[PDB]
PDB file of N, CA, C and O in Angstrom:
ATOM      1  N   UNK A   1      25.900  11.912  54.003  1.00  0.00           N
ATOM      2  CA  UNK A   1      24.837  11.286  53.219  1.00  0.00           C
ATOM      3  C   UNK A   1      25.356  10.095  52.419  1.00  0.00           C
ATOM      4  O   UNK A   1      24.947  10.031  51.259  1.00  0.00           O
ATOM      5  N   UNK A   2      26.190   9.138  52.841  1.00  0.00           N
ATOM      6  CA  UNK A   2      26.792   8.634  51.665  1.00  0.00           C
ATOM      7  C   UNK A   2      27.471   7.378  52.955  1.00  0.00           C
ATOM      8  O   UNK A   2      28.626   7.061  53.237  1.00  0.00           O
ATOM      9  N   UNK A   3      26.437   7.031  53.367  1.00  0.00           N
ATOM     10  CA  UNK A   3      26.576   5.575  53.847  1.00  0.00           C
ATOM     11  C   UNK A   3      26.430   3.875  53.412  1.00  0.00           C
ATOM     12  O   UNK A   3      25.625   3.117  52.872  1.00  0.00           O
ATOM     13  N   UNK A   4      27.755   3.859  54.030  1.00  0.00           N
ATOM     14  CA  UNK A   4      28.528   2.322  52.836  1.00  0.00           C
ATOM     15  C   UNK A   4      28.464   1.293  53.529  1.00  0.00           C
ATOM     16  O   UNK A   4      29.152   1.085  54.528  1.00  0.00           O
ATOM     17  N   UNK A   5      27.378   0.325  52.925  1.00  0.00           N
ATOM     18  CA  UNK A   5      26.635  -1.012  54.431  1.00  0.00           C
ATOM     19  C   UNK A   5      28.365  -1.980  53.500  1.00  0.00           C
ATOM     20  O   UNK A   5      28.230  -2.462  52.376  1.00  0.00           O
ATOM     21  N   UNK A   6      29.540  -2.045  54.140  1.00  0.00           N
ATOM     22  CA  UNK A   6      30.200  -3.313  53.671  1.00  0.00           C
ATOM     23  C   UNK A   6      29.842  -4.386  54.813  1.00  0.00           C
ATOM     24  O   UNK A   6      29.264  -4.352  55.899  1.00  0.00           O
ATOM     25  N   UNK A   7      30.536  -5.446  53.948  1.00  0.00           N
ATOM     26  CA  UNK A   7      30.889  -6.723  54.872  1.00  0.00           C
ATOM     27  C   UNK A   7      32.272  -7.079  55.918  1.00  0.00           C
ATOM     28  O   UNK A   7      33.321  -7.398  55.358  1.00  0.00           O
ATOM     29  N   UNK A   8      32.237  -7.025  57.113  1.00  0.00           N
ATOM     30  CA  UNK A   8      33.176  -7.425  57.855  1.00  0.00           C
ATOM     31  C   UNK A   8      33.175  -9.051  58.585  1.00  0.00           C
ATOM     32  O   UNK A   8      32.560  -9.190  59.642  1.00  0.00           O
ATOM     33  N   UNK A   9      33.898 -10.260  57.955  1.00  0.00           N
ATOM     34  CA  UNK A   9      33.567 -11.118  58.752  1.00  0.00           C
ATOM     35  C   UNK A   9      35.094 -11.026  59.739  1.00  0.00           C
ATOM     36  O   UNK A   9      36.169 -10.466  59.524  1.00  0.00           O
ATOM     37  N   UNK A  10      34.487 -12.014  61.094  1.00  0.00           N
ATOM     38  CA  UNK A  10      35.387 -12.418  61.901  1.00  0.00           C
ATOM     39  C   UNK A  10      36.380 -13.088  61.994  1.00  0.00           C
ATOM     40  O   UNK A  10      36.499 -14.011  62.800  1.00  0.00           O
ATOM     41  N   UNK A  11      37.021 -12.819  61.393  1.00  0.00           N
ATOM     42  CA  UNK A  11      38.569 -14.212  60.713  1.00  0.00           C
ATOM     43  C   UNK A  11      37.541 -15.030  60.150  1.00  0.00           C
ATOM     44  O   UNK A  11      37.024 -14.726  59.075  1.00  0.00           O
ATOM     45  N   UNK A  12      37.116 -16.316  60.967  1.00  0.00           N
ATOM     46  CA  UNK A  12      36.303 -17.407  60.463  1.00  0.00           C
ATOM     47  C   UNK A  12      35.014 -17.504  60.811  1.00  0.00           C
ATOM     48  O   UNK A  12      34.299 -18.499  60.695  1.00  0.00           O
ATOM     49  N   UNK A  13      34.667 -16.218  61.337  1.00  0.00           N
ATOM     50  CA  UNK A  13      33.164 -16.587  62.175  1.00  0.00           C
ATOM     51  C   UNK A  13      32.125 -15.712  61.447  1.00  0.00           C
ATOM     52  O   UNK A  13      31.969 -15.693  60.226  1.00  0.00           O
ATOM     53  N   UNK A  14      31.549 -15.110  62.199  1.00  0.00           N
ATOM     54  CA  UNK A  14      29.898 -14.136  61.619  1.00  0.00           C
ATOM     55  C   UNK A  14      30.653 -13.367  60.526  1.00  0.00           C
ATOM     56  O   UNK A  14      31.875 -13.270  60.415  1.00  0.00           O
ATOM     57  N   UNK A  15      29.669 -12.821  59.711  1.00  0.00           N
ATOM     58  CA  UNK A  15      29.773 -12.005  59.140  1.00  0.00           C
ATOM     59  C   UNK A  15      29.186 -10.490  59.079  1.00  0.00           C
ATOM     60  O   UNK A  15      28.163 -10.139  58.490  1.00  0.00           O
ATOM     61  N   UNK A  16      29.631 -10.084  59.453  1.00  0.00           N
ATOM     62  CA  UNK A  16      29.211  -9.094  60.049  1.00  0.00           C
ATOM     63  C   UNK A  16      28.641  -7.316  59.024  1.00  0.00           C
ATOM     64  O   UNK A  16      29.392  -6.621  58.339  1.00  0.00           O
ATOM     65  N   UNK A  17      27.679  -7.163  59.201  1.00  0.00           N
ATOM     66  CA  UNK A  17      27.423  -5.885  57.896  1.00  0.00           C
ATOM     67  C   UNK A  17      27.876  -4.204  59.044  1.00  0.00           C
ATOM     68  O   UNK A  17      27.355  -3.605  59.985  1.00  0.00           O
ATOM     69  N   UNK A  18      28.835  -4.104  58.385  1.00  0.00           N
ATOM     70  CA  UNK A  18      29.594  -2.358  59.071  1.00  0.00           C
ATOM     71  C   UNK A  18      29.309  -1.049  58.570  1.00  0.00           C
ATOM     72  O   UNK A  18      29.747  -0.632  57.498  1.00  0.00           O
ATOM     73  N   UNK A  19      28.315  -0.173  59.621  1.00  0.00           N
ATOM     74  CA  UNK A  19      27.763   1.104  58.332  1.00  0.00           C
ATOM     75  C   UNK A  19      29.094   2.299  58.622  1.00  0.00           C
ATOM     76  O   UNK A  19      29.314   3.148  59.486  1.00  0.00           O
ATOM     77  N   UNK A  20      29.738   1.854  57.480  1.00  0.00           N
ATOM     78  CA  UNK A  20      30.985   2.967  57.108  1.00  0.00           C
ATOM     79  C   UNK A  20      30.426   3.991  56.271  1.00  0.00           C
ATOM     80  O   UNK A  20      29.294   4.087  55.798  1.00  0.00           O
ATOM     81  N   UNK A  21      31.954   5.127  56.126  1.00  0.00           N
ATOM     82  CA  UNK A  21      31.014   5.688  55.214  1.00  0.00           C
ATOM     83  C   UNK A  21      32.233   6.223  54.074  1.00  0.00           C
ATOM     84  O   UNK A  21      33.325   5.944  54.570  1.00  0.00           O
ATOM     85  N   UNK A  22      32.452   7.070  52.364  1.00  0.00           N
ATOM     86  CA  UNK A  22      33.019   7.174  52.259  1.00  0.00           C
ATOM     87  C   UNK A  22      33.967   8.259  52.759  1.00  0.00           C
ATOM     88  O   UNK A  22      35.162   8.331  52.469  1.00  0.00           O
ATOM     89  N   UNK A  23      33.224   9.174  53.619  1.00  0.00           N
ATOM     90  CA  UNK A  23      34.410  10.167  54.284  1.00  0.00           C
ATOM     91  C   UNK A  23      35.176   9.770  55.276  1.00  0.00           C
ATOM     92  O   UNK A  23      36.029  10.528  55.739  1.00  0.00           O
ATOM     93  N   UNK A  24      34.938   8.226  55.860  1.00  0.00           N
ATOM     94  CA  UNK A  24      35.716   7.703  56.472  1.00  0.00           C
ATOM     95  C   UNK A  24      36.559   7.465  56.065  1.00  0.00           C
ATOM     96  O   UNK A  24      36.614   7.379  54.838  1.00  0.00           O
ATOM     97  N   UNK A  25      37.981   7.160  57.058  1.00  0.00           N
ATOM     98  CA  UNK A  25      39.180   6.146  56.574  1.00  0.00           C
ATOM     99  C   UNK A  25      39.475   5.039  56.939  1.00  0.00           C
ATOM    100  O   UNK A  25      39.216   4.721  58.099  1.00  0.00           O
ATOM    101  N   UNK A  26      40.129   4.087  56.028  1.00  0.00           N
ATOM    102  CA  UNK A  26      40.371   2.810  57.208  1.00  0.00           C
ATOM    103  C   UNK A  26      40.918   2.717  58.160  1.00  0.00           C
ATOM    104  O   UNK A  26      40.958   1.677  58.817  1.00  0.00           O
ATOM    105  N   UNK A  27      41.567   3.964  58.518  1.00  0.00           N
ATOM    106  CA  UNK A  27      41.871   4.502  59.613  1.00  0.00           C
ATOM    107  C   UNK A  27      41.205   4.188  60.898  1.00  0.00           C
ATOM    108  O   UNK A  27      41.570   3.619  61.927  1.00  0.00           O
ATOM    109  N   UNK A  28      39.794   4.909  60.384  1.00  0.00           N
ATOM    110  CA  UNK A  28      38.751   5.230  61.548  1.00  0.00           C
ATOM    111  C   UNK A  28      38.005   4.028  62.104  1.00  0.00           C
ATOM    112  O   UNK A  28      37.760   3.807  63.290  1.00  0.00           O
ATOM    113  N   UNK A  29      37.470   2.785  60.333  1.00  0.00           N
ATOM    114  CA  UNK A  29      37.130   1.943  60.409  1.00  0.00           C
ATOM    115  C   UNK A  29      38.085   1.261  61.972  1.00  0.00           C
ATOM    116  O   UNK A  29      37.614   0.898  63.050  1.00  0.00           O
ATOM    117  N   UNK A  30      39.648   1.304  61.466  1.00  0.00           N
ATOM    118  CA  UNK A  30      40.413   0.550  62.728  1.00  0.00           C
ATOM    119  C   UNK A  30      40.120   0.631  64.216  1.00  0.00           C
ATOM    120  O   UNK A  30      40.112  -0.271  65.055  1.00  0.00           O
ATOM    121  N   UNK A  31      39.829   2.228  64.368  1.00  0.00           N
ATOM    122  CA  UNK A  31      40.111   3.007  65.272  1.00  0.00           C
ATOM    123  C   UNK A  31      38.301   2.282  65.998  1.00  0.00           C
ATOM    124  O   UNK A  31      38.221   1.843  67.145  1.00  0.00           O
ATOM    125  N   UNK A  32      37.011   2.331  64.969  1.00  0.00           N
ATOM    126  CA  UNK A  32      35.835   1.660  65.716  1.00  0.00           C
ATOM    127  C   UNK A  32      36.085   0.527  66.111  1.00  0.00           C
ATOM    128  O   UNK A  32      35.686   0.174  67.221  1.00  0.00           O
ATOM    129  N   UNK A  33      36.763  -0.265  65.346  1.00  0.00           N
ATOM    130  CA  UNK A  33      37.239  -1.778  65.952  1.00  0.00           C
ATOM    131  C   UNK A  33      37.670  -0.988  66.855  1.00  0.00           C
ATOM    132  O   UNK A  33      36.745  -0.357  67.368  1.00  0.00           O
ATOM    133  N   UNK A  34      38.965  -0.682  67.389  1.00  0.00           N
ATOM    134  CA  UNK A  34      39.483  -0.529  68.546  1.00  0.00           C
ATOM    135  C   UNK A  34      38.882   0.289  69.720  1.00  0.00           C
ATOM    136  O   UNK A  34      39.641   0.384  70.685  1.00  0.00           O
ATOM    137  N   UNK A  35      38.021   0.727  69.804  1.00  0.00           N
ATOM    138  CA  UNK A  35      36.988   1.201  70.532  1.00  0.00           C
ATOM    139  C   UNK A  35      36.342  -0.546  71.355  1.00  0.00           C
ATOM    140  O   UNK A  35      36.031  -0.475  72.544  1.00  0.00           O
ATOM    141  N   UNK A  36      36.248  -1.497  70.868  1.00  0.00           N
ATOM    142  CA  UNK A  36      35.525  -2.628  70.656  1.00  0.00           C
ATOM    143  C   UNK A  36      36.321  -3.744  70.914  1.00  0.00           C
ATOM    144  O   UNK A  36      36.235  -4.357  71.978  1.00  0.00           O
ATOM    145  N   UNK A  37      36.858  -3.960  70.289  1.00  0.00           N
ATOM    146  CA  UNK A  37      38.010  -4.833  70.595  1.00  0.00           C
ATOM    147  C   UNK A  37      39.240  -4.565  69.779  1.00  0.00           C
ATOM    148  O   UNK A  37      39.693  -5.132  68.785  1.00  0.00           O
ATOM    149  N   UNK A  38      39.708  -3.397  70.582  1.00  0.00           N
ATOM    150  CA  UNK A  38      40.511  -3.002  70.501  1.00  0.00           C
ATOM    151  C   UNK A  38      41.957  -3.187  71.204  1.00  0.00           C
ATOM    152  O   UNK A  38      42.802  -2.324  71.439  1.00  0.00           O
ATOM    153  N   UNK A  39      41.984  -4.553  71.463  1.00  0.00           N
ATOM    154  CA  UNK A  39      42.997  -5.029  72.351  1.00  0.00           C
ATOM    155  C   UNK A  39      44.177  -4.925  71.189  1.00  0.00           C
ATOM    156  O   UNK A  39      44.145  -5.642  70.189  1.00  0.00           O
ATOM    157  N   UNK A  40      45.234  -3.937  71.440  1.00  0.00           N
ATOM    158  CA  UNK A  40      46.057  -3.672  70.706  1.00  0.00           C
ATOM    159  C   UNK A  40      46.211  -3.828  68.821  1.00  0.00           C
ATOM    160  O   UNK A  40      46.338  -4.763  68.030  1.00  0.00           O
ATOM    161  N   UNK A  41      46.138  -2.743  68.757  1.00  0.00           N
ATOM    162  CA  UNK A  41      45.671  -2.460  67.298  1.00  0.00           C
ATOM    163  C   UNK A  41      46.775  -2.726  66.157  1.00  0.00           C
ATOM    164  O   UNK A  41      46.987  -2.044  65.154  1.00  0.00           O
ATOM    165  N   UNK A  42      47.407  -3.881  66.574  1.00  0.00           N
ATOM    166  CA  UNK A  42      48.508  -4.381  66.066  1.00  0.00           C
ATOM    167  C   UNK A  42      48.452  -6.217  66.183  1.00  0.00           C
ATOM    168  O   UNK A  42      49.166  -7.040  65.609  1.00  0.00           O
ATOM    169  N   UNK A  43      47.515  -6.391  66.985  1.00  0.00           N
ATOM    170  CA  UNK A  43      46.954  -7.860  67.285  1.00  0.00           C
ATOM    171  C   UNK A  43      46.115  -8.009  66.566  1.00  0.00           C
ATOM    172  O   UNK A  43      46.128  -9.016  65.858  1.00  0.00           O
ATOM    173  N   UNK A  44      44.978  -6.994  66.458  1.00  0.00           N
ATOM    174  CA  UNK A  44      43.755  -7.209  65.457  1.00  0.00           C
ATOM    175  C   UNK A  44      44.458  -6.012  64.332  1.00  0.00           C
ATOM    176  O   UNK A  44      45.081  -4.959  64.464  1.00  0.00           O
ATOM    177  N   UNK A  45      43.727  -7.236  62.633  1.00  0.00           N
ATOM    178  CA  UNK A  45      43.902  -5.920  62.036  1.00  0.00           C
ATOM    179  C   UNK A  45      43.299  -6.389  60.540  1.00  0.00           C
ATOM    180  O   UNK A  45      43.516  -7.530  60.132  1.00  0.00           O
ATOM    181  N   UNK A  46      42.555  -5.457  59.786  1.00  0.00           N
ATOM    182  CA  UNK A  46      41.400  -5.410  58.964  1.00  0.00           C
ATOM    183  C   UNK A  46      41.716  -5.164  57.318  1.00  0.00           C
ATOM    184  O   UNK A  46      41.873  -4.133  56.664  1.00  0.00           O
ATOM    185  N   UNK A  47      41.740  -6.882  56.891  1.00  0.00           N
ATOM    186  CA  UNK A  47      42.201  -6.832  55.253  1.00  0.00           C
ATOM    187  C   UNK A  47      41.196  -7.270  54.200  1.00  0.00           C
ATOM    188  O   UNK A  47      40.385  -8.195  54.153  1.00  0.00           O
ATOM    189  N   UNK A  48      41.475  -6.445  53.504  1.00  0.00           N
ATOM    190  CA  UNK A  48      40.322  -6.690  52.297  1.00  0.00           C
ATOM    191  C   UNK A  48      40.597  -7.525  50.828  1.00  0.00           C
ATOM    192  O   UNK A  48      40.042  -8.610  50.659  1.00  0.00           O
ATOM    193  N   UNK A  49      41.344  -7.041  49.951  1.00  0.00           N
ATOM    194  CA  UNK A  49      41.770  -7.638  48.549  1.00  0.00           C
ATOM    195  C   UNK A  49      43.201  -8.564  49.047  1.00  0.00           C
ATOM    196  O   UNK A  49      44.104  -8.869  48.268  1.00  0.00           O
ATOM    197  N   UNK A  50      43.173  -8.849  50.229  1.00  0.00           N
ATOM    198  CA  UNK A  50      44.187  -9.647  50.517  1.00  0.00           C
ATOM    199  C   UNK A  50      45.567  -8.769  51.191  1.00  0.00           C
ATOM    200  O   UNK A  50      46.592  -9.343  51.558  1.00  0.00           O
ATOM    201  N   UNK A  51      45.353  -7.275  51.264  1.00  0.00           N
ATOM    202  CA  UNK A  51      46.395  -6.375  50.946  1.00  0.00           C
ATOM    203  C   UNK A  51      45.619  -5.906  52.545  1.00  0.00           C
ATOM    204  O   UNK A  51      44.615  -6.449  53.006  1.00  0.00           O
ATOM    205  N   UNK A  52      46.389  -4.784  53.184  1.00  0.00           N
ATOM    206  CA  UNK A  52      46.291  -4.294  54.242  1.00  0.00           C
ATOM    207  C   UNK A  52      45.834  -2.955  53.813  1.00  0.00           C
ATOM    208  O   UNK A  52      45.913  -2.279  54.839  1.00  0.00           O
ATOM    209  N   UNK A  53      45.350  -2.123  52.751  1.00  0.00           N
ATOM    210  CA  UNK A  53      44.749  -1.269  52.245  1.00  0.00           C
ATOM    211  C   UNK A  53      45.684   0.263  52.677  1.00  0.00           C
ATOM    212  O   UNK A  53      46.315   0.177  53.731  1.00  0.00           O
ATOM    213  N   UNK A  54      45.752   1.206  52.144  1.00  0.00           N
ATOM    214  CA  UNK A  54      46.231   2.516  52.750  1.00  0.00           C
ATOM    215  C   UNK A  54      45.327   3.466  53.794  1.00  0.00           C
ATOM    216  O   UNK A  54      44.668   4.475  53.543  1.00  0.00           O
ATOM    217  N   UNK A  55      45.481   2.976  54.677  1.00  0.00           N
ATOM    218  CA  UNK A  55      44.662   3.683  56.146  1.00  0.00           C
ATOM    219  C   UNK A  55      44.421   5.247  56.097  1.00  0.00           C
ATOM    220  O   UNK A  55      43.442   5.902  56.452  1.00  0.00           O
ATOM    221  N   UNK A  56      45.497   5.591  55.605  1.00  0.00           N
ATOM    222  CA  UNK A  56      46.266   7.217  55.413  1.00  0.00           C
ATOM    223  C   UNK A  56      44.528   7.880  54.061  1.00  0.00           C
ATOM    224  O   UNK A  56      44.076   9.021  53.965  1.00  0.00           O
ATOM    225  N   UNK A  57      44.013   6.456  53.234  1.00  0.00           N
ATOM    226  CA  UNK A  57      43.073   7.133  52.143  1.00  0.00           C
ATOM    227  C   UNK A  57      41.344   6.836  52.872  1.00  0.00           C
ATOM    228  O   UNK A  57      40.954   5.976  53.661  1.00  0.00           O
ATOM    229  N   UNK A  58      40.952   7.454  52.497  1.00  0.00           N
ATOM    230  CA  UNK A  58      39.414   6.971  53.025  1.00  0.00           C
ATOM    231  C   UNK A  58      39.112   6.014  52.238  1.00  0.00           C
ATOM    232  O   UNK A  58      39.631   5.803  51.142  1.00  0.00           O
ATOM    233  N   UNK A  59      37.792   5.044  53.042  1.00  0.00           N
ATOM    234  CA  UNK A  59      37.115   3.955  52.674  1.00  0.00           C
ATOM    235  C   UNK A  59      36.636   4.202  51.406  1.00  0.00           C
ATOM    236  O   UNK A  59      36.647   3.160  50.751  1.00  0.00           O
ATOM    237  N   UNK A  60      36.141   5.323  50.672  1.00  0.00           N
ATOM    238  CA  UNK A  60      35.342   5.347  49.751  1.00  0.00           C
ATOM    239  C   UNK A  60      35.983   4.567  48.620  1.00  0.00           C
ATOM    240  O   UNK A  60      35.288   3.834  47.916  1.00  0.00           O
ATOM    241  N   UNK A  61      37.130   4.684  48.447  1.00  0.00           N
ATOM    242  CA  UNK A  61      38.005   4.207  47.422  1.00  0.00           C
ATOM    243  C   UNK A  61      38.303   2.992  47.443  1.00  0.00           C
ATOM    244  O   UNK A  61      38.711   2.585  46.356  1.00  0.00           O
ATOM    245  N   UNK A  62      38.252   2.082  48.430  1.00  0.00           N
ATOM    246  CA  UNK A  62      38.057   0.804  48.630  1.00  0.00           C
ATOM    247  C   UNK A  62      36.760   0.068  48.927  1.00  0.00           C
ATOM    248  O   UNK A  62      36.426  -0.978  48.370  1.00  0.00           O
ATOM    249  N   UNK A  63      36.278   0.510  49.567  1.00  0.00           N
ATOM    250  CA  UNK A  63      35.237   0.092  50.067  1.00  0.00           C
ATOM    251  C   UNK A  63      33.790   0.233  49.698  1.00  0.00           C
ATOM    252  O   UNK A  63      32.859  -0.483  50.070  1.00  0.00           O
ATOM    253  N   UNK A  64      33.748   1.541  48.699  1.00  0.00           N
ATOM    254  CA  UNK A  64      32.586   1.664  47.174  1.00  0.00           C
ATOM    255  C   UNK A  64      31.717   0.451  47.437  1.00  0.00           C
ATOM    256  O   UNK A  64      30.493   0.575  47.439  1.00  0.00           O
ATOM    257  N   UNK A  65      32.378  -0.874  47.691  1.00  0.00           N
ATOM    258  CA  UNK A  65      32.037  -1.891  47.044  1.00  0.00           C
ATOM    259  C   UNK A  65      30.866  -2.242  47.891  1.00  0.00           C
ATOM    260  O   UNK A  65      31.514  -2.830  48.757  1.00  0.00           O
ATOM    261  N   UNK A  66      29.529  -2.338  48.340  1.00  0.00           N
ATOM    262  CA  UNK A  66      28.569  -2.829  49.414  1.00  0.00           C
ATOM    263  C   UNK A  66      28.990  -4.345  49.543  1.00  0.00           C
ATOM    264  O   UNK A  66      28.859  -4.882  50.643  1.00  0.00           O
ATOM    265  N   UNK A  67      29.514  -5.097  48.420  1.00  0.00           N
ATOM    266  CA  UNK A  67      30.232  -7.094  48.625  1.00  0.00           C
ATOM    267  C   UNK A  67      31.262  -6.728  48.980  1.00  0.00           C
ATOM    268  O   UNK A  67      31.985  -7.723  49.029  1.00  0.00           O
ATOM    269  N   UNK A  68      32.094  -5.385  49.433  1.00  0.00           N
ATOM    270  CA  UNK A  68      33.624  -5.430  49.868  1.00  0.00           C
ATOM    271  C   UNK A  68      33.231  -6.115  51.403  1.00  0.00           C
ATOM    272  O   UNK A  68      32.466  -5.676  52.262  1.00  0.00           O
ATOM    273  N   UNK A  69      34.172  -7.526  51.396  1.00  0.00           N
ATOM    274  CA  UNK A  69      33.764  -8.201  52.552  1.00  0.00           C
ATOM    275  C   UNK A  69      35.635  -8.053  52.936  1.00  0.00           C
ATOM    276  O   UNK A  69      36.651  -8.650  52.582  1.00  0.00           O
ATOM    277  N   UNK A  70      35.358  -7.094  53.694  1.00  0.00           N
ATOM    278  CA  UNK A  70      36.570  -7.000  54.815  1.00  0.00           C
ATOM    279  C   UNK A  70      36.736  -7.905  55.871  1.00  0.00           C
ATOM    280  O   UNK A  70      35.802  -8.364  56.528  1.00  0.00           O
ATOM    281  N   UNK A  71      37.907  -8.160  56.034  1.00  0.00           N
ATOM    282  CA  UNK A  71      38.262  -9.890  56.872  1.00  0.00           C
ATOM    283  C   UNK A  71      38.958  -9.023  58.246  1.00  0.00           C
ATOM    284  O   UNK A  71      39.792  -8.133  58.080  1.00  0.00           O
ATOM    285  N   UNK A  72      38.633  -9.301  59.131  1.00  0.00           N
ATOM    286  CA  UNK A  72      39.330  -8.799  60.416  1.00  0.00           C
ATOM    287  C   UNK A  72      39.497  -9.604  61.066  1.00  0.00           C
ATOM    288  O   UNK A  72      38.729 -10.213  61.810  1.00  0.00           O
ATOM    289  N   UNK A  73      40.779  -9.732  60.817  1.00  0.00           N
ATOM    290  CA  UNK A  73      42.008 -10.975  61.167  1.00  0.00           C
ATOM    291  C   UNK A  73      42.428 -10.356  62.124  1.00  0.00           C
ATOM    292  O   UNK A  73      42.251  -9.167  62.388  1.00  0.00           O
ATOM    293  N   UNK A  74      43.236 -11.449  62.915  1.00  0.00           N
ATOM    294  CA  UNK A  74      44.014 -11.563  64.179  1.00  0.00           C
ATOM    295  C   UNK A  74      45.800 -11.769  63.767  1.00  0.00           C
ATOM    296  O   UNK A  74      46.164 -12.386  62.765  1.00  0.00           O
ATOM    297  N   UNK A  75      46.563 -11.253  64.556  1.00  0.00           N
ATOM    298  CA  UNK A  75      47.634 -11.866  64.202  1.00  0.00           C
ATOM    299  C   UNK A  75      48.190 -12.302  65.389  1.00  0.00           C
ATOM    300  O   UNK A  75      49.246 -12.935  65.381  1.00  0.00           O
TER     301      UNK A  75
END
């Protein structure tokens, strides 16, 4: 019951609205990217406060935020 509309844009492109939730982790968040474009989950990879976030904690703790606009960068 506790679905979290954040923002995901594309490195530089759309911006994209992602229905996470807080029992998720950024884990999982990764793991739907990689379902998707998931071309090696070490090529793509999903930063928020500038920081690469702790995957290991769920979204709720980061991602609370509905303006948390998560950047899913390429490397």
């Amino acid at each position: 019951d506790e679905p979290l509309s954040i923002l995901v844009r594309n490195n530089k492109g759309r911006s994209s609205t992602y229905e996470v939730r807080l029992t998720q982790t950024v884990a999982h968040l990764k793991q739907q990217v990689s379902g998707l474009e998931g071309v090696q989950d070490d090529l793509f990879w999903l930063t928020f406060e500038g920081k690469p976030l702790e995957d290991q904690l769920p979204l709720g703790e980061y991602g609370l935020k509905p303006l948390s606009t998560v950047f899913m960068n390429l490397r």
